Amino acid sequence: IPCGESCVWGPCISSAIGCSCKSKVCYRNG
């Protein structure tokens, strides 16, 4: 599930809420 953050140049600030960079945007479990 996309969270609402891009990660093309820098990692997900939303890692705090469980989101990780996949395919240039931040996702939690798809």
Residue numbers in the entry: 1 to 30
From the reporting publication:
Cyclotides are a large family of topologically unique peptides characterized by a head-to-tail cyclic backbone and three interlocked disulfide bonds. This combination of structural features forms a cyclic cystine knot (CCK) motif and confers cyclotides exceptional stability. Cyclotides are divided into three subfamilies: bracelet, Möbius, and trypsin inhibitor subfamilies. Since cyclotides were first reported two decades ago, studies on bracelet cyclotides have been hampered by their low synthetic yields because of poor oxidative folding efficiency.
To explore the effect of substituting the Ile residue in loop 2 to Gly, we first introduced the mutation into cyO2, which is considered a prototypical bracelet cyclotide and is one of the most studied. Remarkably, the point mutation of Ile to a smaller residue led to a significant improvement in folding yield from negligible amounts for cyO2 to over 50% for the mutant cyO2. We found that when the loop 2 Ile is mutated to Gly, bracelet cyclotides could be folded with high yield, albeit with loss of activity. All [I11G] mutants did not bind the model membrane at peptide concentrations up to 128 µM, except [I11G]hD, which showed an 18-fold weaker affinity to membranes compared to its parent peptide. The negative effect of the [I11G] bracelet cyclotide mutation on lipid binding was expected, as the mutation reduces surface hydrophobicity, a previously reported determinant of membrane binding. [I11L] mutants exhibited similar or slightly higher cytotoxicity compared to their parent cyclotides, whereas the [I11G] mutants had substantially reduced or no activity, which correlates well with their membrane binding. Having determined the crystal structures of wild-type cyO2 and hyen D, we were interested in definitively showing their Ile-11 to Gly and Leu mutants have native-like structures to support our earlier NMR chemical shift analysis. Their structures were solved using racemic or quasi-racemic crystallography. Like the case of cyO2 mutants, [I11L]hD and [I11G]hD structures only exhibited minor differences in the mainchain and sidechain conformations, confirming both Leu and Gly substitutions are well tolerated by the bracelet fold.
